[PDB]
Structures are given as C-alpha cells and as structure tokens.
PDB file of N, CA and C in Angstrom:
ATOM      1  N   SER A   2      16.695 -10.018  13.509  1.00 47.71           N
ATOM      2  CA  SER A   2      15.684 -10.194  14.546  1.00 47.71           C
ATOM      3  C   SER A   2      14.843 -11.446  14.257  1.00 47.71           C
ATOM      4  N   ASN A   3      14.170 -11.899  15.315  1.00 47.49           N
ATOM      5  CA  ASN A   3      13.204 -12.972  15.224  1.00 47.49           C
ATOM      6  C   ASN A   3      11.994 -12.595  14.370  1.00 47.49           C
ATOM      7  N   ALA A   4      11.330 -13.637  13.930  1.00 48.82           N
ATOM      8  CA  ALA A   4      10.181 -13.553  13.010  1.00 48.82           C
ATOM      9  C   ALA A   4       8.900 -12.926  13.626  1.00 48.82           C
ATOM     10  N   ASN A   5       8.887 -12.631  14.926  1.00 50.23           N
ATOM     11  CA  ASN A   5       7.772 -11.926  15.552  1.00 50.23           C
ATOM     12  C   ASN A   5       7.948 -10.383  15.526  1.00 50.23           C
ATOM     13  N   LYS A   6       8.996  -9.913  14.881  1.00 50.38           N
ATOM     14  CA  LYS A   6       9.296  -8.498  14.840  1.00 50.38           C
ATOM     15  C   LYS A   6       8.096  -7.690  14.432  1.00 50.38           C
ATOM     16  N   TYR A   7       7.386  -8.200  13.419  1.00 51.74           N
ATOM     17  CA  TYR A   7       6.315  -7.401  12.761  1.00 51.74           C
ATOM     18  C   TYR A   7       4.994  -7.445  13.485  1.00 51.74           C
ATOM     19  N   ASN A   8       4.772  -8.570  14.147  1.00 56.39           N
ATOM     20  CA  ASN A   8       3.601  -8.708  15.014  1.00 56.39           C
ATOM     21  C   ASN A   8       3.740  -7.890  16.318  1.00 56.39           C
ATOM     22  N   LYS A   9       4.958  -7.732  16.862  1.00 57.04           N
ATOM     23  CA  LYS A   9       5.205  -6.832  18.031  1.00 57.04           C
ATOM     24  C   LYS A   9       4.915  -5.352  17.688  1.00 57.04           C
ATOM     25  N   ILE A  10       5.486  -4.859  16.588  1.00 59.48           N
ATOM     26  CA  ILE A  10       5.123  -3.540  16.092  1.00 59.48           C
ATOM     27  C   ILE A  10       3.582  -3.400  15.905  1.00 59.48           C
ATOM     28  N   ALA A  11       2.937  -4.329  15.207  1.00 63.05           N
ATOM     29  CA  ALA A  11       1.481  -4.243  15.005  1.00 63.05           C
ATOM     30  C   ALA A  11       0.811  -4.125  16.344  1.00 63.05           C
ATOM     31  N   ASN A  12       1.176  -4.977  17.282  1.00 63.02           N
ATOM     32  CA  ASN A  12       0.525  -4.914  18.599  1.00 63.02           C
ATOM     33  C   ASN A  12       0.768  -3.623  19.360  1.00 63.02           C
ATOM     34  N   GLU A  13       2.004  -3.123  19.291  1.00 63.54           N
ATOM     35  CA  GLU A  13       2.319  -1.862  19.975  1.00 63.54           C
ATOM     36  C   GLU A  13       1.493  -0.769  19.339  1.00 63.54           C
ATOM     37  N   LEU A  14       1.429  -0.760  17.999  1.00 63.11           N
ATOM     38  CA  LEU A  14       0.652   0.261  17.294  1.00 63.11           C
ATOM     39  C   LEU A  14      -0.827   0.209  17.708  1.00 63.11           C
ATOM     40  N   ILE A  15      -1.441  -0.984  17.672  1.00 61.63           N
ATOM     41  CA  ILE A  15      -2.876  -1.131  18.046  1.00 61.63           C
ATOM     42  C   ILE A  15      -3.056  -0.633  19.499  1.00 61.63           C
ATOM     43  N   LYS A  16      -2.133  -1.024  20.395  1.00 62.04           N
ATOM     44  CA  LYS A  16      -2.239  -0.634  21.751  1.00 62.04           C
ATOM     45  C   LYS A  16      -2.174   0.902  21.977  1.00 62.04           C
ATOM     46  N   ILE A  17      -1.313   1.590  21.243  1.00 64.67           N
ATOM     47  CA  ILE A  17      -1.246   3.010  21.413  1.00 64.67           C
ATOM     48  C   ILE A  17      -2.447   3.769  20.782  1.00 64.67           C
ATOM     49  N   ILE A  18      -2.915   3.319  19.630  1.00 60.26           N
ATOM     50  CA  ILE A  18      -4.055   3.976  18.938  1.00 60.26           C
ATOM     51  C   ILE A  18      -5.322   3.650  19.735  1.00 60.26           C
ATOM     52  N   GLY A  19      -5.442   2.428  20.216  1.00 61.58           N
ATOM     53  CA  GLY A  19      -6.627   1.986  20.934  1.00 61.58           C
ATOM     54  C   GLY A  19      -7.407   1.070  20.017  1.00 61.58           C
ATOM     55  N   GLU A  20      -7.661  -0.178  20.418  1.00 61.22           N
ATOM     56  CA  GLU A  20      -8.326  -1.084  19.483  1.00 61.22           C
ATOM     57  C   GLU A  20      -9.702  -0.569  18.968  1.00 61.22           C
ATOM     58  N   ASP A  21     -10.505  -0.036  19.888  1.00 59.79           N
ATOM     59  CA  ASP A  21     -11.860   0.372  19.528  1.00 59.79           C
ATOM     60  C   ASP A  21     -11.862   1.832  19.030  1.00 59.79           C
ATOM     61  N   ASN A  22     -10.649   2.397  18.883  1.00 60.23           N
ATOM     62  CA  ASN A  22     -10.492   3.703  18.231  1.00 60.23           C
ATOM     63  C   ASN A  22     -10.256   3.555  16.699  1.00 60.23           C
ATOM     64  N   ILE A  23     -10.243   2.319  16.194  1.00 58.25           N
ATOM     65  CA  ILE A  23      -9.883   2.037  14.795  1.00 58.25           C
ATOM     66  C   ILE A  23     -11.157   1.824  14.009  1.00 58.25           C
ATOM     67  N   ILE A  24     -11.376   2.587  12.937  1.00 57.40           N
ATOM     68  CA  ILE A  24     -12.524   2.326  12.043  1.00 57.40           C
ATOM     69  C   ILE A  24     -12.134   1.237  11.023  1.00 57.40           C
ATOM     70  N   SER A  25     -10.995   1.450  10.330  1.00 56.47           N
ATOM     71  CA  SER A  25     -10.503   0.521   9.321  1.00 56.47           C
ATOM     72  C   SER A  25      -9.042   0.860   9.045  1.00 56.47           C
ATOM     73  N   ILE A  26      -8.339  -0.038   8.325  1.00 54.98           N
ATOM     74  CA  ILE A  26      -6.935   0.031   8.151  1.00 54.98           C
ATOM     75  C   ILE A  26      -6.644  -0.397   6.754  1.00 54.98           C
ATOM     76  N   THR A  27      -5.720   0.306   6.073  1.00 56.51           N
ATOM     77  CA  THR A  27      -5.119  -0.154   4.807  1.00 56.51           C
ATOM     78  C   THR A  27      -3.672   0.312   4.799  1.00 56.51           C
ATOM     79  N   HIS A  28      -3.053   0.320   3.631  1.00 53.81           N
ATOM     80  CA  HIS A  28      -1.674   0.740   3.556  1.00 53.81           C
ATOM     81  C   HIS A  28      -1.325   1.227   2.176  1.00 53.81           C
ATOM     82  N   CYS A  29      -0.238   1.970   2.026  1.00 49.92           N
ATOM     83  CA  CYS A  29       0.295   2.238   0.676  1.00 49.92           C
ATOM     84  C   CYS A  29       1.695   1.594   0.648  1.00 49.92           C
ATOM     85  N   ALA A  30       2.578   2.109  -0.211  1.00 49.31           N
ATOM     86  CA  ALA A  30       3.866   1.467  -0.388  1.00 49.31           C
ATOM     87  C   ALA A  30       4.705   1.683   0.824  1.00 49.31           C
ATOM     88  N   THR A  31       4.446   2.760   1.589  1.00 50.30           N
ATOM     89  CA  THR A  31       5.374   3.077   2.694  1.00 50.30           C
ATOM     90  C   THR A  31       4.628   3.331   3.989  1.00 50.30           C
ATOM     91  N   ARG A  32       3.297   3.540   3.931  1.00 52.54           N
ATOM     92  CA  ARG A  32       2.572   3.893   5.153  1.00 52.54           C
ATOM     93  C   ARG A  32       1.409   2.945   5.520  1.00 52.54           C
ATOM     94  N   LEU A  33       1.288   2.663   6.798  1.00 54.62           N
ATOM     95  CA  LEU A  33       0.103   2.034   7.397  1.00 54.62           C
ATOM     96  C   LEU A  33      -0.894   3.186   7.631  1.00 54.62           C
ATOM     97  N   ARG A  34      -2.086   3.078   7.061  1.00 51.58           N
ATOM     98  CA  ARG A  34      -3.033   4.156   7.107  1.00 51.58           C
ATOM     99  C   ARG A  34      -4.253   3.718   7.915  1.00 51.58           C
ATOM    100  N   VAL A  35      -4.436   4.326   9.082  1.00 51.98           N
ATOM    101  CA  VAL A  35      -5.490   3.905  10.031  1.00 51.98           C
ATOM    102  C   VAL A  35      -6.574   4.992  10.139  1.00 51.98           C
ATOM    103  N   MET A  36      -7.817   4.692   9.712  1.00 52.28           N
ATOM    104  CA  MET A  36      -8.943   5.632   9.877  1.00 52.28           C
ATOM    105  C   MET A  36      -9.322   5.467  11.355  1.00 52.28           C
ATOM    106  N   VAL A  37      -9.199   6.560  12.140  1.00 56.14           N
ATOM    107  CA  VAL A  37      -9.451   6.511  13.573  1.00 56.14           C
ATOM    108  C   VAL A  37     -10.707   7.361  13.956  1.00 56.14           C
ATOM    109  N   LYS A  38     -11.361   6.977  15.052  1.00 57.62           N
ATOM    110  CA  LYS A  38     -12.478   7.715  15.608  1.00 57.62           C
ATOM    111  C   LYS A  38     -12.068   9.047  16.253  1.00 57.62           C
ATOM    112  N   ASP A  39     -10.998   9.010  17.022  1.00 56.01           N
ATOM    113  CA  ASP A  39     -10.519  10.186  17.777  1.00 56.01           C
ATOM    114  C   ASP A  39      -8.966  10.263  17.770  1.00 56.01           C
ATOM    115  N   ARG A  40      -8.417  11.113  16.894  1.00 54.85           N
ATOM    116  CA  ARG A  40      -6.985  11.299  16.893  1.00 54.85           C
ATOM    117  C   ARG A  40      -6.436  11.863  18.227  1.00 54.85           C
ATOM    118  N   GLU A  41      -7.268  12.622  18.935  1.00 57.26           N
ATOM    119  CA  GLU A  41      -6.841  13.409  20.075  1.00 57.26           C
ATOM    120  C   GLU A  41      -6.560  12.581  21.319  1.00 57.26           C
ATOM    121  N   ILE A  42      -6.781  11.264  21.263  1.00 55.41           N
ATOM    122  CA  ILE A  42      -6.359  10.399  22.347  1.00 55.41           C
ATOM    123  C   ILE A  42      -5.142   9.517  21.963  1.00 55.41           C
ATOM    124  N   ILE A  43      -4.581   9.734  20.754  1.00 58.15           N
ATOM    125  CA  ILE A  43      -3.447   8.947  20.268  1.00 58.15           C
ATOM    126  C   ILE A  43      -2.165   9.750  20.621  1.00 58.15           C
ATOM    127  N   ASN A  44      -1.269   9.114  21.399  1.00 59.10           N
ATOM    128  CA  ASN A  44      -0.057   9.731  21.851  1.00 59.10           C
ATOM    129  C   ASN A  44       1.004   9.589  20.732  1.00 59.10           C
ATOM    130  N   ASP A  45       1.152  10.623  19.908  1.00 59.86           N
ATOM    131  CA  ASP A  45       1.999  10.499  18.722  1.00 59.86           C
ATOM    132  C   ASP A  45       3.408  10.126  19.131  1.00 59.86           C
ATOM    133  N   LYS A  46       3.878  10.705  20.235  1.00 61.25           N
ATOM    134  CA  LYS A  46       5.279  10.508  20.657  1.00 61.25           C
ATOM    135  C   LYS A  46       5.560   9.043  20.959  1.00 61.25           C
ATOM    136  N   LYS A  47       4.552   8.344  21.490  1.00 65.50           N
ATOM    137  CA  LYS A  47       4.710   6.930  21.770  1.00 65.50           C
ATOM    138  C   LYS A  47       4.670   6.135  20.484  1.00 65.50           C
ATOM    139  N   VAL A  48       3.825   6.554  19.538  1.00 66.82           N
ATOM    140  CA  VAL A  48       3.859   5.901  18.253  1.00 66.82           C
ATOM    141  C   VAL A  48       5.210   6.029  17.568  1.00 66.82           C
ATOM    142  N   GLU A  49       5.810   7.199  17.619  1.00 67.27           N
ATOM    143  CA  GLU A  49       7.036   7.465  16.920  1.00 67.27           C
ATOM    144  C   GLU A  49       8.181   6.618  17.463  1.00 67.27           C
ATOM    145  N   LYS A  50       8.089   6.219  18.733  1.00 70.28           N
ATOM    146  CA  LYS A  50       9.119   5.399  19.424  1.00 70.28           C
ATOM    147  C   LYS A  50       9.042   3.905  19.074  1.00 70.28           C
ATOM    148  N   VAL A  51       7.941   3.455  18.405  1.00 70.36           N
ATOM    149  CA  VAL A  51       7.825   2.060  18.005  1.00 70.36           C
ATOM    150  C   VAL A  51       8.901   1.681  16.930  1.00 70.36           C
ATOM    151  N   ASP A  52       9.499   0.484  17.068  1.00 68.77           N
ATOM    152  CA  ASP A  52      10.442  -0.086  16.085  1.00 68.77           C
ATOM    153  C   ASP A  52       9.943   0.126  14.637  1.00 68.77           C
ATOM    154  N   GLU A  53      10.848   0.641  13.800  1.00 72.06           N
ATOM    155  CA  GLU A  53      10.624   0.838  12.381  1.00 72.06           C
ATOM    156  C   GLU A  53       9.765   2.041  12.050  1.00 72.06           C
ATOM    157  N   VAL A  54       9.185   2.712  13.050  1.00 71.17           N
ATOM    158  CA  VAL A  54       8.317   3.879  12.700  1.00 71.17           C
ATOM    159  C   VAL A  54       9.202   5.071  12.338  1.00 71.17           C
ATOM    160  N   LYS A  55       9.105   5.542  11.089  1.00 69.25           N
ATOM    161  CA  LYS A  55       9.974   6.613  10.584  1.00 69.25           C
ATOM    162  C   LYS A  55       9.384   7.988  10.951  1.00 69.25           C
ATOM    163  N   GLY A  56       8.045   8.055  10.988  1.00 71.00           N
ATOM    164  CA  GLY A  56       7.345   9.255  11.420  1.00 71.00           C
ATOM    165  C   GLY A  56       5.856   8.955  11.497  1.00 71.00           C
ATOM    166  N   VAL A  57       5.080   9.951  11.894  1.00 70.31           N
ATOM    167  CA  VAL A  57       3.595   9.813  11.963  1.00 70.31           C
ATOM    168  C   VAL A  57       2.990  11.092  11.487  1.00 70.31           C
ATOM    169  N   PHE A  58       1.814  11.011  10.856  1.00 66.28           N
ATOM    170  CA  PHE A  58       1.048  12.204  10.462  1.00 66.28           C
ATOM    171  C   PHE A  58      -0.431  11.866  10.586  1.00 66.28           C
ATOM    172  N   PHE A  59      -1.229  12.882  10.948  1.00 63.82           N
ATOM    173  CA  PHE A  59      -2.665  12.751  10.864  1.00 63.82           C
ATOM    174  C   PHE A  59      -3.210  13.780   9.855  1.00 63.82           C
ATOM    175  N   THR A  60      -3.991  13.300   8.893  1.00 58.27           N
ATOM    176  CA  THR A  60      -4.664  14.237   8.038  1.00 58.27           C
ATOM    177  C   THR A  60      -5.922  13.556   7.526  1.00 58.27           C
ATOM    178  N   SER A  61      -7.019  14.336   7.357  1.00 57.64           N
ATOM    179  CA  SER A  61      -8.220  13.841   6.627  1.00 57.64           C
ATOM    180  C   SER A  61      -8.782  12.513   7.191  1.00 57.64           C
ATOM    181  N   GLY A  62      -8.805  12.413   8.515  1.00 55.79           N
ATOM    182  CA  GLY A  62      -9.304  11.225   9.196  1.00 55.79           C
ATOM    183  C   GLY A  62      -8.295  10.078   9.278  1.00 55.79           C
ATOM    184  N   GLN A  63      -7.178  10.187   8.564  1.00 57.08           N
ATOM    185  CA  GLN A  63      -6.182   9.103   8.468  1.00 57.08           C
ATOM    186  C   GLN A  63      -4.987   9.367   9.383  1.00 57.08           C
ATOM    187  N   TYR A  64      -4.774   8.431  10.315  1.00 59.93           N
ATOM    188  CA  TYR A  64      -3.548   8.382  11.119  1.00 59.93           C
ATOM    189  C   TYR A  64      -2.483   7.514  10.368  1.00 59.93           C
ATOM    190  N   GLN A  65      -1.392   8.133   9.870  1.00 61.51           N
ATOM    191  CA  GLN A  65      -0.506   7.477   8.940  1.00 61.51           C
ATOM    192  C   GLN A  65       0.812   7.197   9.691  1.00 61.51           C
ATOM    193  N   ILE A  66       1.266   5.940   9.646  1.00 63.41           N
ATOM    194  CA  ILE A  66       2.488   5.571  10.303  1.00 63.41           C
ATOM    195  C   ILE A  66       3.438   5.177   9.220  1.00 63.41           C
ATOM    196  N   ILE A  67       4.538   5.925   9.085  1.00 62.44           N
ATOM    197  CA  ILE A  67       5.482   5.647   7.999  1.00 62.44           C
ATOM    198  C   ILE A  67       6.397   4.494   8.447  1.00 62.44           C
ATOM    199  N   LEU A  68       6.332   3.367   7.730  1.00 64.88           N
ATOM    200  CA  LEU A  68       7.149   2.189   8.047  1.00 64.88           C
ATOM    201  C   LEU A  68       8.202   1.889   6.950  1.00 64.88           C
ATOM    202  N   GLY A  69       8.003   2.393   5.736  1.00 66.50           N
ATOM    203  CA  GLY A  69       8.955   2.136   4.665  1.00 66.50           C
ATOM    204  C   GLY A  69       8.476   0.945   3.841  1.00 66.50           C
ATOM    205  N   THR A  70       8.999   0.819   2.630  1.00 66.46           N
ATOM    206  CA  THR A  70       8.625  -0.327   1.798  1.00 66.46           C
ATOM    207  C   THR A  70       8.972  -1.686   2.454  1.00 66.46           C
ATOM    208  N   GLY A  71       8.185  -2.699   2.100  1.00 69.65           N
ATOM    209  CA  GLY A  71       8.374  -4.055   2.585  1.00 69.65           C
ATOM    210  C   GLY A  71       8.045  -4.199   4.067  1.00 69.65           C
ATOM    211  N   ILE A  72       8.604  -3.340   4.939  1.00 68.34           N
ATOM    212  CA  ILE A  72       8.232  -3.375   6.362  1.00 68.34           C
ATOM    213  C   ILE A  72       6.717  -3.060   6.503  1.00 68.34           C
ATOM    214  N   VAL A  73       6.178  -2.105   5.708  1.00 69.63           N
ATOM    215  CA  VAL A  73       4.762  -1.785   5.809  1.00 69.63           C
ATOM    216  C   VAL A  73       3.846  -3.017   5.517  1.00 69.63           C
ATOM    217  N   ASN A  74       4.187  -3.844   4.511  1.00 69.23           N
ATOM    218  CA  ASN A  74       3.376  -5.038   4.138  1.00 69.23           C
ATOM    219  C   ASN A  74       3.397  -6.123   5.174  1.00 69.23           C
ATOM    220  N   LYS A  75       4.586  -6.308   5.824  1.00 71.42           N
ATOM    221  CA  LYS A  75       4.811  -7.337   6.833  1.00 71.42           C
ATOM    222  C   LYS A  75       4.040  -6.980   8.101  1.00 71.42           C
ATOM    223  N   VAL A  76       3.962  -5.676   8.398  1.00 70.88           N
ATOM    224  CA  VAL A  76       3.151  -5.215   9.558  1.00 70.88           C
ATOM    225  C   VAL A  76       1.671  -5.326   9.203  1.00 70.88           C
ATOM    226  N   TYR A  77       1.347  -4.986   7.963  1.00 72.77           N
ATOM    227  CA  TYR A  77      -0.051  -5.083   7.575  1.00 72.77           C
ATOM    228  C   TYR A  77      -0.547  -6.562   7.710  1.00 72.77           C
ATOM    229  N   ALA A  78       0.273  -7.520   7.269  1.00 71.52           N
ATOM    230  CA  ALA A  78      -0.065  -8.941   7.314  1.00 71.52           C
ATOM    231  C   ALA A  78      -0.321  -9.474   8.776  1.00 71.52           C
ATOM    232  N   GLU A  79       0.366  -8.878   9.753  1.00 70.92           N
ATOM    233  CA  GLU A  79       0.096  -9.183  11.140  1.00 70.92           C
ATOM    234  C   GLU A  79      -1.261  -8.588  11.533  1.00 70.92           C
ATOM    235  N   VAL A  80      -1.483  -7.301  11.260  1.00 72.27           N
ATOM    236  CA  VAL A  80      -2.772  -6.676  11.622  1.00 72.27           C
ATOM    237  C   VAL A  80      -3.967  -7.411  10.991  1.00 72.27           C
ATOM    238  N   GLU A  81      -3.773  -7.895   9.752  1.00 72.45           N
ATOM    239  CA  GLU A  81      -4.790  -8.675   9.022  1.00 72.45           C
ATOM    240  C   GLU A  81      -5.365  -9.899   9.790  1.00 72.45           C
ATOM    241  N   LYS A  82      -4.641 -10.467  10.759  1.00 74.55           N
ATOM    242  CA  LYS A  82      -5.165 -11.626  11.491  1.00 74.55           C
ATOM    243  C   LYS A  82      -5.888 -11.169  12.767  1.00 74.55           C
ATOM    244  N   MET A  83      -5.625  -9.928  13.158  1.00 75.74           N
ATOM    245  CA  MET A  83      -6.107  -9.400  14.412  1.00 75.74           C
ATOM    246  C   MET A  83      -7.633  -9.179  14.361  1.00 75.74           C
ATOM    247  N   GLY A  84      -8.225  -9.216  13.171  1.00 75.25           N
ATOM    248  CA  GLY A  84      -9.665  -9.100  13.065  1.00 75.25           C
ATOM    249  C   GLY A  84     -10.226  -7.690  12.871  1.00 75.25           C
ATOM    250  N   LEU A  85      -9.381  -6.670  12.929  1.00 71.92           N
ATOM    251  CA  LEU A  85      -9.893  -5.324  12.708  1.00 71.92           C
ATOM    252  C   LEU A  85     -10.364  -5.284  11.242  1.00 71.92           C
ATOM    253  N   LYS A  86     -11.153  -4.270  10.890  1.00 70.89           N
ATOM    254  CA  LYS A  86     -11.541  -4.005   9.526  1.00 70.89           C
ATOM    255  C   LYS A  86     -10.291  -3.544   8.734  1.00 70.89           C
ATOM    256  N   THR A  87      -9.659  -4.470   8.041  1.00 74.81           N
ATOM    257  CA  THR A  87      -8.550  -4.164   7.149  1.00 74.81           C
ATOM    258  C   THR A  87      -9.119  -4.145   5.750  1.00 74.81           C
ATOM    259  N   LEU A  88      -8.614  -3.283   4.910  1.00 74.89           N
ATOM    260  CA  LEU A  88      -9.406  -3.108   3.737  1.00 74.89           C
ATOM    261  C   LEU A  88      -8.641  -3.508   2.512  1.00 74.89           C
ATOM    262  N   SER A  89      -7.319  -3.206   2.485  1.00 77.31           N
ATOM    263  CA  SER A  89      -6.397  -3.617   1.404  1.00 77.31           C
ATOM    264  C   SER A  89      -6.880  -4.928   0.730  1.00 77.31           C
ATOM    265  N   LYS A  90      -6.938  -6.040   1.483  1.00 78.53           N
ATOM    266  CA  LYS A  90      -7.530  -7.302   0.990  1.00 78.53           C
ATOM    267  C   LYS A  90      -9.014  -7.126   0.680  1.00 78.53           C
ATOM    268  N   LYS A  91      -9.289  -6.608  -0.534  1.00 78.27           N
ATOM    269  CA  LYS A  91     -10.650  -6.403  -1.040  1.00 78.27           C
ATOM    270  C   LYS A  91     -11.353  -7.725  -1.011  1.00 78.27           C
ATOM    271  N   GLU A  92     -12.660  -7.687  -0.778  1.00 78.18           N
ATOM    272  CA  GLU A  92     -13.438  -8.908  -0.586  1.00 78.18           C
ATOM    273  C   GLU A  92     -13.889  -9.554  -1.894  1.00 78.18           C
ATOM    274  N   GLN A  93     -13.972 -10.882  -1.887  1.00 82.39           N
ATOM    275  CA  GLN A  93     -14.464 -11.632  -3.045  1.00 82.39           C
ATOM    276  C   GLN A  93     -15.548 -10.905  -3.850  1.00 82.39           C
ATOM    277  N   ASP A  94     -15.206 -10.745  -5.132  1.00 84.91           N
ATOM    278  CA  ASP A  94     -16.159 -10.366  -6.167  1.00 84.91           C
ATOM    279  C   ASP A  94     -17.174 -11.530  -6.358  1.00 84.91           C
ATOM    280  N   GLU A  95     -18.482 -11.203  -6.413  1.00 82.34           N
ATOM    281  CA  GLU A  95     -19.524 -12.190  -6.737  1.00 82.34           C
ATOM    282  C   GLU A  95     -19.737 -12.263  -8.284  1.00 82.34           C
ATOM    283  N   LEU A  96     -20.078 -13.457  -8.821  1.00 82.80           N
ATOM    284  CA  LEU A  96     -20.237 -13.628 -10.297  1.00 82.80           C
ATOM    285  C   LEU A  96     -21.436 -12.899 -10.959  1.00 82.80           C
TER     286      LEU A  96
END
C-alpha cells in the first residue's frame, strides 16, 4: 500500500470516536489507547471495520484499538501531528 495507509486509519479512527470526545491518547506495543469522554457514542462496529483493526475493547476509561506491533506506532505517529493530547511523547524535562 501507499505511504498514507497509517494516516487514513488514524483519520477514520478519530472520525468514529469523535475529535472532541478524546481526552488524551497513548499506546502500548499492540494497542492505541484513547481516554474518551463518552464511550456510549462510539460505534464499536465501525471501529472494528477500519483497516488493521484486530479488535476493540473499552475498560477503565480507555477505548483500546488493537493494531498489532509496528502498525500501532505508525498510526500513533500520524495522530501525533493531528494536535490531540498525545502522551507517549513525554514532554521536555526542565534542568
């Protein structure tokens, strides 16, 4: 596939969750982890249909999208430019 593969998934994901429904975002080795305001407006079935999405779970305020290793980082790197509160990239330590 073309090099926009990961930015299309990021955009589809943001669009289904709702941009202003996102508190903050990070990831682990296999999952994109989105702290959301209201899970009950997120259409899980539409999320599950997105390219590369292996499954979805909500628990403990976290909407988790399983993308698999390597694919999860490439999607995270697209979301990182979108301006949402992404957290993985911890902020500069002061001296």
